[PDB]
Design a protein around this nucleic acid. Structure first.
Ligand code: ATP
Ligand code: ATP
Ligand code: ATP
Ligand code: CA
Ligand code: MG
Ligand code: MG
Ligand code: MG
Lengths: 314, 98, 205, 337
DNA sequence: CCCCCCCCCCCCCCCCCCCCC
């Protein structure tokens, strides 16, 4: 059961300190054992030595190893957000692409997912003060639509060197789902030796549409997809990289031409942030927040220029 | 409870004790069971839990289920009446009919 | 399956058609007087005749093995003392379920349950043979795990006890919505084994 | 503990020879088992069962009138945990029960995590304001904990809870009373529930458990050909959670995923149904369902969200409507059905 | 050597022009 703060008297703490802590509301040794040092310091008449000695005395009476919310928040203040090359998208996402989580973007054809992937693969190598992540990029491609010339164009736009940018990108091609999982294993083995800041799968659901074809193979398809997404989550958690995947759409025939992403509930639950891309006018596109745990739903406009993804011109 | 023989022995003893109590004290004993899934011929059917030998324990067995949106009560087993099926519903006042 | 229904029909027919005493031993609460009255109402319409037939059936409740053994021994002693009399002697004895009182004693690595059930079998055999009576008992059905074949419960030791066995079954679900039951001769000593017939519980009432 | 009883010396010697330790040990076995072990006879074995059963409890008579009248002696029957919104509390007739698992299931973006965070914040309020004056435990299974949204909610709390005076709000240490745990496997989740949760509950540092997505590991580790081990694990987890909740009088909130219906379970005209099957459904007390209609918000412009009561021993099947904003989850007045 | 038992999984997929004062 809980132990009253009066137990601190036997440990060698003055009764005045115990009375002051009781005035502060700390009625249990467990409550004061997890209080932050700054909170104790802000109490009048308590110095750094006094707070340290109180914490040391209370530490050996209360079990440790549980993380509170304040510790979790103060340990995550170093999180990095990578710029997307567009000011409007950065404002919409409030900083850019978050590291350590899974971001998914879906839409019909021509909406501009591969272009965003290329722009991110280039901009992930910028210094942190310029909006980058200062690391390498990894590209897993399941369609054969990887073009280094777009990377060269973006690198020239940002004033970098094309040779180094091309040297700092690892590329692999997947021919079926089993090869996709094996490539993920190889990537997990590879990420230890060097430092990586991004991982791109494009696309994550193209091969599942045809490898498991029919009504009678739905369950195995969803099972395999769930295993793949779990492996992606483990990689992102362990190495603190940003995972970006793309998805396709299907038409709603049961009841303005509406469309929904494929993959069912598995990919919807696995993903953290979801972005909806649709065609605008000319070279301009529209991005909409489809689902996010901390962002209200809104819209923004960007464009696909000759040097990657950027703001709409006029 | 991984030792199923012990479970069956305990269940049989409990059933015998309950029927003895009901007969000796002129009571009515009501027991509620759960439903499980039986997988055969790639088809799933709902059956009462605790095995087949538990079906002999009770004297009268009733089964409740949904058909489409109504609730049905089926007299699955009885030594004095005949198998039937009726309709009931739950109101703010409790167990009712229609 | 309909074991209790068959026993009730037999008891009613013997009590009314032949006018002889019947003793009913119940171990699971499956005996009801309303069903007996309903069965009797389909054979006669005289109220006094029905009451006289009902007065010839004795009901005994036994819920554990020791009570059943005591009841059987008391019946043996009563019949032994009642040799001279002829109007009142019990001719048919029905044990509603021998499995309900032996199942709790079976299990583990012990051997007391086997001895007790063998003692019960010896009591039943003595009652049947020595006193020239008719003894009918009911048993549960089990499926073999290694072979998937339906067999009587209580084990191989119990498999040797009865001199005649009848197996009841439902007719594949369809065509057996009620009353329609499947009868068979699992064991006998005067007929080949395997012959099948047809019964209808609904028409008996 | 077997020597606290009143038995003949021969019986005590026999049961000691059988390596029987406690009353639970002797009540675990059956009559024939004790007959084979102690080498006794039926009457004294029956008397031993008498004594053990009386030792576990007895001589206390409890009636429904006492439960209905003595409110302080039975807080389980009369005390509820508020959800932070008057409309949702009116829908739930006070709030969550203090004994039993409560499920919350729905499709993606329905708003389950927001409700979990709101409950974790509201559990810290005084008794007269719907709280239990204690912290909470949060277990994450699928994603990382959303600390930014929690910070925003803690900052906005004085503007949501209008009834509570500001002076009492100022002294509340919201972030210091919430504990966060991470789990990556079924076995890890079972070990966490078995070991870390009871330690936190016994010391009184928390009076609420949020397992969050309980279906996440089971969807990925068990196929359709391994239903028996999955059922065994689910039964063990449910039994442990129910035992902890009953022992410490703390609610347990579980978040579940849905699957396409594609109706023995009473889900005829519904698109989706809760996952994990009937084995998990047998362990629950109150079942809720949060839903979002994307085909109606296309006309309204604003999202359409409803909270429904699927089943409860004391609540009729009804529903209401709510919205999500910077403050948190708030109910819409005059919408209960 | 002795007797009898367990339980589901999961969404897919657009079609098709009419009509002169
Ligand atoms: N050098 C370039 N300058 C301008 N626009 C370009 C250039 N290269 C490609 N684009 C634009 O890229 C668009 C296609 O976008 P993208 O390749 O990202 O499609 P996607 O969403 O991946 O499609 P899919 O579903 O078919 O895989 C074209 O409409 C084209 O206008
Ligand atoms: N600050 C905010 N203001 C308004 N709405 C917000 C805010 N943060 C999140 N939301 C809303 O939260 C919704 C998603 O809620 P939530 O993250 O609780 O979903 P969920 O039911 O837990 O889903 P999942 O299955 O993905 O875990 C989004 O639709 C978004 O509109
Ligand atoms: N009056 C009646 N009319 C028609 N059918 C009846 C009537 N009374 C009983 N039955 C039938 O009797 C059946 C049950 O038979 P019975 O009671 O003999 O079973 P049993 O084999 O003794 O079962 P148990 O193992 O549970 O003791 C019921 O399914 C019902 O259809
Ligand atoms: Ca999600
Ligand atoms: Mg593409
Ligand atoms: Mg019967
Ligand atoms: Mg969530």
């Amino acid at each position: 059961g809980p132990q009253p703060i009066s137990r601190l008297e036997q440990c060698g703490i003055n009764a005045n300190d115990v009375k002051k802590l009781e005035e502060a509301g700390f009625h249990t040794v467990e409550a004061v054992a997890y209080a932050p040092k700054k909170e104790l310091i802000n109490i009048k008449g308590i110095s750094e030595a006094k707070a340290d000695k109180i914490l040391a005395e209370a530490a050996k009476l209360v079990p440790m190893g549980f993380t509170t919310a304040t510790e979790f928040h103060q340990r995550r203040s170093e999180i990095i957000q990578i710029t997307t090359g567009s000011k409007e998208l950065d404002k919409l996402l409030q900083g850019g692409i978050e590291t350590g989580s899974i971001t998914e973007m879906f839409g019909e054809f021509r909406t501009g997912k591969t272009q965003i992937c290329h722009t991110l693969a280039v901009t992930c190598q910028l210094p942190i003060d310029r909006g980058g992540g200062e690391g390498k990029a990894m590209y897993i491609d399941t369609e054969g639509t990887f073009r280094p010339e777009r990377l060269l164009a973006v690198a020239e736009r940002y004033g970098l060197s094309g040779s180094d940018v091309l040297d700092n990108v690892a590329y692999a091609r997947a021919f079926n789902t089993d090869h996709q999982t094996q490539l993920l294993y190889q990537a997990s083995a590879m990420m230890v030796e060097s430092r990586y800041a991004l991982l791109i799968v494009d696309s994550a659901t193209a091969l599942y549409r045809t490898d498991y074809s029919g009504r009678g193979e739905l369950s195995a398809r969803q099972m395999h997809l769930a295993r793949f997404l779990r492996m992606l989550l483990r990689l992102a958690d362990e190495f603190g990289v940003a995972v970006v995947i793309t998805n396709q759409v299907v038409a709603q025939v049961d009841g303005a031409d509406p469309k929904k992403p494929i993959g069912g509930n598995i990919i919807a639950h696995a993903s953290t942030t979801r972005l909806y891309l649709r065609k605008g006018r000319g070279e301009t596109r529209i991005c909409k927040i489809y689902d996010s745990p901390c962002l209200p739903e809104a819209e923004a406009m960007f464009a696909i220029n000759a040097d990657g993804v950027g703001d709409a011109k006029d | 409870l991984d030792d199923l023989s012990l479970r069956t022995r305990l269940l049989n003893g409990l059933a015998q004790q309950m029927i003895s109590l009901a007969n000796n004290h002129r009571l009515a004993v009501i027991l509620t069971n759960q439903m499980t899934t039986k997988i055969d011929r790639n088809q799933a059917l709902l059956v009462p839990a605790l095995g087949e030998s538990w079906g002999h324990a009770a004297t009268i067995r009733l089964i409740f289920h949904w058909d489409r949106k109504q609730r049905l009560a089926t007299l699955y087993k009885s030594p004095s009446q005949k198998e039937c099926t009726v309709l009931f519903q739950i109101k703010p006042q409790g167990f009712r009919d229609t | 399956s309909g074991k209790t229904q068959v026993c009730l029909c037999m008891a009613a027919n013997v009590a009314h058609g032949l006018q002889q005493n019947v003793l009913y031993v119940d171990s699971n609460g499956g005996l009801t007087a309303s069903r007996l009255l309903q069965l009797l109402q389909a054979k006669t319409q005289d109220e006094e005749e029905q009451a006289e037939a009902l007065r010839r059936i004795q009901v005994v409740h036994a819920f554990d093995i020791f009570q059943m053994l005591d009841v059987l021994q008391e019946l043996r002693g009563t019949v032994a003392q009642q040799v001279t009399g002829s109007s009142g002697t019990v001719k048919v004895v029905v044990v509603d379920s021998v499995t309900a009182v032996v199942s709790p004693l079976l299990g583990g690595q012990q051997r007391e349950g086997l001895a007790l059930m063998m003692q019960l079998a010896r009591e039943l055999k003595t009652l049947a043979r020595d006193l020239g009576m008719a003894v009918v008992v009911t048993n549960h059905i089990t499926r073999d795990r290694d072979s998937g074949r339906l067999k009587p419960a209580l084990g191989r030791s119990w498999s040797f006890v009865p001199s005649t066995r009848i197996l009841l079954d439902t007719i594949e679900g369809a065509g057996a919505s009620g009353g329609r039951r499947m009868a068979c001769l699992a064991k006998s000593s005067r007929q080949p084994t395997g012959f099948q017939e047809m019964v209808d519980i609904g028409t008996w009432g | 503990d077997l020597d606290l009883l009143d038995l003949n010396p021969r019986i005590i010697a026999a049961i000691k020879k059988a390596k029987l330790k406690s009353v639970k040990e002797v009540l675990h076995f059956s009559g024939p088992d004790l007959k084979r072990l102690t080498n006794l006879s039926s009457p004294e074995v029956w008397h031993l069962l008498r004594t053990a059963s009386l030792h576990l409890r007895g001589s206390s008579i409890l009636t429904a009138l006492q439960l209905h009248q003595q409110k302080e002696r039975f807080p389980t029957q009369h005390q509820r945990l508020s959800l932070g919104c008057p409309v949702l509390d009116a829908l739930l007739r006070g709030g969550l029960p203090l004994d039993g698992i409560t499920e919350l299931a729905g499709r993606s973006s329905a708003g389950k995590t927001q409700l979990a965070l709101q409950l974790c914040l509201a559990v810290q309020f005084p008794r007269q304001h719907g709280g239990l004056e204690a912290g909470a435990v949060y277990i994450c299974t699928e994603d990382a904990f959303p600390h930014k949204r929690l910070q925003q909610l803690m900052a906005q709390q004085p503007r949501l809870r209008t009834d509570v005076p500001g002076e009492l709000l100022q002294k509340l240490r919201f972030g210091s009373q919430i504990f966060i745990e991470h789990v990556a496997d079924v076995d890890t989740l079972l070990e966490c529930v078995n070991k870390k949760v009871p330690v936190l509950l016994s010391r009184g540092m928390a009076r609420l458990v949020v397992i969050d997505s309980v279906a996440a590991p089971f969807r990925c580790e068990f196929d359709s050909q391994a239903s028996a081990p999955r059922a065994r694990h689910l039964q063990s987890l449910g039994a442990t959670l129910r035992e902890l909740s009953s022992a410490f009088q703390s609610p347990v909130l579980c978040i579940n995923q849905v699957t396409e219906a594609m109706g023995p379970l009473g889900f005829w005209d519904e698109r989706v149904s809760p996952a994990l099957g009937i084995t998990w459904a047998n362990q629950l007390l109150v079942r809720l369902l949060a839903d979002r209609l994307r085909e109606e918000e296309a006309a309204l412009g604003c999202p359409a969200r409803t909270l429904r009561v699927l089943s409860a021993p004391h609540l009729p099947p009804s529903s209401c409507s709510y919205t999500i904003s910077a403050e948190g989850v708030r109910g819409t007045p005059g919408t209960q059905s």
